[PDB]
Amino acid sequence: ADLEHNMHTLNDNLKHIEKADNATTVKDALTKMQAAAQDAWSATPPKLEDKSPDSPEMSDFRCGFWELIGQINAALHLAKQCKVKEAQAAAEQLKTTCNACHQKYR
């Protein structure tokens, strides 16, 4: 998938996690987010099209997806423990990472 739709997947599923009332819906939504974040790591955003592949901005862009992937995996562990409110709280914390990347590069 392209970067735009990977963002649709992250956003759409993150909103279902907030609305959910059970661990299974949360785990399923987080699984879809994990695959979108894994795919997105390799993209180049439009604001960075002219930078070199080794620029600090592109290293910083990749670091943001590393952070996001790790936090999604940690939320998945909580959902697998049937700790639904804890997983939802971890999914909310994820938005700090979404926000930080958007501020600089979206």
Task: State the binding site for heme b.
Answer: 7, 102
Among 25, 32, 38, 39, binds Zn ion (CB under 5 A): 39
Residue 105 as a binder of ligand HEC (CB under 6 A): the answer is yes
Residue type, 103: Q
Q: At what angle do helices 23-40 and 84-105 cross, to 10 degrees?
A: 30
Q: How far is the CB of 55 from Zn ion (least distance, A)?
A: 22
CA distance readout (Å), 45 to 30, 37, 64:
23, 14, 13
Residue 73's binding partner out of a copy of itself, ligand HEC, Zn ion, none, with CB under 5 to 8 Å set by partner kind? a copy of itself
Which residues inside 15-34 make contact with a copy of itself, applying CB under 8 A?
16, 21-25, 28
Cα 105 to the center of its chain, rounded Å: 15
Distance CA 7, CA 26 (A): 18
Q: Which long-range contacts (C-beta less than 8 Å, at least 24 apart) are formed by 49-57?
A: 57/104, 57/105
Chain residues binding a copy of itself by CB under 8 A are 1-2, 5, 8, 12-13, 16, 21-25, 28, 41-44, 52-54, 58-59, 62-64, 66-67, 69-71, 73-78, 80-83, 90, 93-94, 96-97, 100
